[PDB]
C-alpha cells in the first residue's frame, strides 16, 4: 500500500522538474547550419562566436541555439527528417566559385532542400559568402560568367537595385544575377508558407549575428500573421 504512495511522490517530483524544463525548452530558438564545402562556413561560425557541433549565443536576452552537422556527410540525406521543427535553416554558398560546376551543385542542393516533404514550412536564410573574390574575378578577370552560365547574356539589371557606393555596374550585375538565380527557385513553389532571405557577406563583416535575429523575428511575425488570416 505504501508502494503506491512512494510511486506517487516520485511522479510528483518528476512532473515538478518537467515544469521547470518546459519553460527553457520553449524559450530557446533552434537553427540549422547547412552549407557545401569551401563555402566559408567555419569563418562565419567563428565570427559569430566572437559528429555534431552546438553553439550558444544570446542577442537582446533571446536564446539562440545553432547546430552544425559534419559527422554524416553523404549525397543521400536521411537524417534531415529530424529538423522539421527548427525556426530557420542557414544556407552558406560561395558566390565566387562559379567556375571552380560548384555553383550549379549548390543550386541543385538548394532545390532539393526546398522541395522536401518534411521541410514544407521551414524558411531559409541565404548567405552569399566571399564577396571580394567575386569582385576580383569580375573586375579585369580572364574568365567570364558567359561561358559557364549562358543565361547571363540576356540578363538586365533590375531598376530597384541599391548598389553600395563606389562599386562598378559589372559586379552589381553579377551579384544580382547570382541572387536571382536562387530567388527563381525560391519563388516557384513557395505557396506563402515559407520564404527566403538572401544576404551578401564577406570576411570582414560584423552584423551577421544581428541579421539572423532580424530574420527570425520576421519569420515568427509572418507565421503569426498568416495563422490569423491577415496576410
Amino acid at each position: 500500500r505504501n508502494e503506491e504512495k512512494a510511486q506517487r511522490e516520485a511522479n510528483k517530483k518528476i512532473e515538478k522538474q518537467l515544469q521547470k524544463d518546459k519553460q527553457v525548452y520553449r524559450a530557446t530558438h533552434r537553427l540549422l547550419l547547412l552549407g557545401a564545402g569551401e563555402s566559408g562556413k567555419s569563418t562565419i561560425v567563428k565570427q559569430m562566436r566572437i559528429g555534431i557541433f552546438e553553439t550558444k549565443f544570446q542577442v537582446d536576452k533571446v536564446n539562440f541555439h545553432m547546430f552544425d552537422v559534419g559527422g554524416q556527410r553523404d549525397e543521400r540525406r536521411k537524417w534531415i527528417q529530424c529538423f522539421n521543427d527548427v525556426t530557420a535553416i542557414i544556407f552558406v554558398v560561395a558566390s565566387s566559385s562559379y567556375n571552380m560546376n560548384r555553383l550549379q551543385e549548390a543550386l541543385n542542393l538548394f532545390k532539393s532542400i526546398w522541395n522536401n516533404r518534411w521541410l514544407r514550412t521551414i524558411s531559409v536564410i541565404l548567405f552569399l559568402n566571399k564577396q571580394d573574390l567575386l569582385a576580383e574575378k569580375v573586375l579585369a578577370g580572364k574568365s567570364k560568367i558567359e561561358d559557364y552560365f549562358p543565361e547571363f547574356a540576356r540578363y538586365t539589371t533590375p531598376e530597384d537595385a541599391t548598389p553600395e557606393p563606389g562599386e562598378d555596374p559589372r559586379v552589381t550585375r553579377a551579384k544580382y544575377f547570382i541572387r536571382d538565380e536562387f530567388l527563381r527557385i525560391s519563388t516557384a513553389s513557395g505557396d506563402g508558407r515559407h520564404y527566403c532571405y538572401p544576404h551578401f557577406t564577406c570576411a570582414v563583416d560584423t552584423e551577421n549575428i544581428r541579421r539572423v535575429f532580424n530574420d527570425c523575428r520576421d519569420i515568427i511575425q509572418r507565421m503569426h500573421l498568416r495563422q490569423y488570416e491577415l496576410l
Binding site: 510511486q7 516520485a10 518528476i14 522538474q17 524544463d21 525548452y25 559527422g71
Partner: protein, 329 residues
C-alpha cells in the same frame, strides 16, 4: 570479373525451381479472423517533443521511450505513472533499448555514440565510440555485449566491459535502418537503404543469405516467432514476408488506396496478425496467412514512428510525433 551475372542468374533459377505453389494457394480454406476492434486503454503524457523510439520491458509492465527534447522516461503501464527521467548530453536521439535483465538502458542518436545507463546503482556507465555515422538501432544481446547498426553501412558487436568492437559486419551499400534478433540470439537480420535485407551470423561474423524484394528503402524489420521467417516494411507502402529455408518471399501486403510510407512492423504471439504503422496518422492490422486487413488503430494526430508488442502478448503500444504514447488492447 563479369561472371557475377551468371551466379545471380543461377541463384534466381534455383530459387524459382523451388516455387511449387504460392502461400495463398496453400492457405485458402482457412476461416478468416474477422473484424478486430481495439480501443485505447491508457494514454501517457510528459514528452515535450516528438517520440522516435520505445522498447517494452521483459516483464510486460515497464517500458522506455525517447524524444527529441533529450530525455528518456521509464513508464509504468499498469498505474500510468513515471519512474525515471534521464536528461541527455545530446538532444538528437533515434533509438533506445531496454536490457533483458532490466538493469540497463541504452540510447543512441545523431552523435556517433551509444550510451548505456545503470538503473540499479542513474548515471552513465559506458560510452561506445567507433561508428562514423549516426546510429539507427541497438539491441541488448546480453548483459555484457550489445549489437548496433549505424548509418555508415556497418554493424558491430560491442563489448561493454572493454568498449572495443569485437566483430564488424559489412556488405550493405546504403544506410542501415533497423535490425532484429532471433529468439535464440544466434542470428540477426538487418534492413538497409539499398532495398535489401541480409542474414548475419553473430559468432562467425559473415553473411549467410540476401533478400532483394523491395524497390525502396526498408525502414522496419521484424522476426517471426517460429524463427524461420521475417517481415519488412518499406516506403513503397508494401510489407513482404520472406523465409529463411526457402530463400524467397511468400506474400505481399498492400492496398491500392494507400500510398504512404511504413515506419514500423511487429507480429503477435501466434504470428497470425501483423501490425504495421504508417505515415497516414494511423496503424493497420493485417492477416499474415491471407493478406487481408482486419482492423484499424486510429487516434494519433501525427505520424506513427514506434510500435511494440509485449512478451505475453497482452497489449500493443504505439508512439507518434504528437508526443503521446497509447496502449491498445
Amino acid at each position: 570479373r563479369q561472371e557475377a551475372e551468371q551466379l545471380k542468374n543461377q541463384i534466381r533459377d534455383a530459387r524459382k525451381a523451388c516455387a511449387d505453389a504460392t502461400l495463398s494457394q496453400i492457405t485458402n480454406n482457412i476461416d478468416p479472423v474477422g473484424r478486430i476492434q481495439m480501443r485505447t486503454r491508457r494514454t501517457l503524457r510528459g514528452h515535450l517533443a516528438k517520440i522516435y523510439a520505445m522498447h517494452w520491458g521483459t516483464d510486460s509492465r515497464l517500458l522506455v521511450s525517447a524524444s527529441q527534447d533529450g530525455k528518456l522516461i521509464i513508464w509504468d503501464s499498469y498505474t500510468t505513472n513515471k519512474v525515471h527521467a534521464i536528461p541527455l548530453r545530446s538532444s538528437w536521439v533515434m533509438t533506445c533499448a531496454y536490457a533483458p535483465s532490466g538493469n540497463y538502458v541504452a540510447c543512441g542518436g545523431l552523435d556517433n555514440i551509444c550510451s548505456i545507463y545503470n538503473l540499479k546503482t542513474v548515471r552513465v556507465s559506458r560510452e561506445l565510440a567507433g561508428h562514423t555515422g549516426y546510429l539507427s538501432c541497438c539491441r541488448f544481446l546480453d548483459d555484457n555485449q550489445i549489437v548496433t547498426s549505424s548509418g555508415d553501412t556497418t554493424c558491430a558487436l560491442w563489448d561493454i566491459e572493454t568498449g572495443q568492437q569485437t566483430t564488424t559486419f559489412t556488405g550493405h551499400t546504403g544506410d542501415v535502418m533497423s535490425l532484429s534478433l532471433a529468439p535464440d540470439t544466434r542470428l540477426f537480420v538487418s534492413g538497409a537503404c539499398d532495398a535489401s535485407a541480409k542474414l548475419w551470423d553473430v559468432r562467425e561474423g559473415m553473411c549467410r543469405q540476401t533478400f532483394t524484394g523491395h524497390e525502396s528503402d526498408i525502414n522496419a524489420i521484424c522476426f517471426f516467432p517460429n524463427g524461420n521467417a521475417f517481415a519488412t516494411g518499406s516506403d513503397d507502402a508494401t510489407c513482404r514476408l520472406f523465409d529463411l529455408r526457402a530463400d524467397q518471399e511468400l506474400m505481399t501486403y498492400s492496398h491500392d488506396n494507400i500510398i504512404c510510407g511504413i515506419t514500423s512492423v511487429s507480429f503477435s504471439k501466434s504470428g497470425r496478425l501483423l501490425l504495421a504503422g504508417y505515415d497516414d496518422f494511423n496503424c493497420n492490422v493485417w492477416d499474415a496467412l491471407k493478406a487481408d486487413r482486419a482492423g484499424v488503430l486510429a487516434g494519433h494526430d501525427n505520424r506513427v514512428s514506434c510500435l511494440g508488442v509485449t512478451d505475453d502478448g497482452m497489449a500493443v503500444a504505439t508512439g507518434s510525433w504528437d508526443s503521446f504514447l497509447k496502449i491498445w488492447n
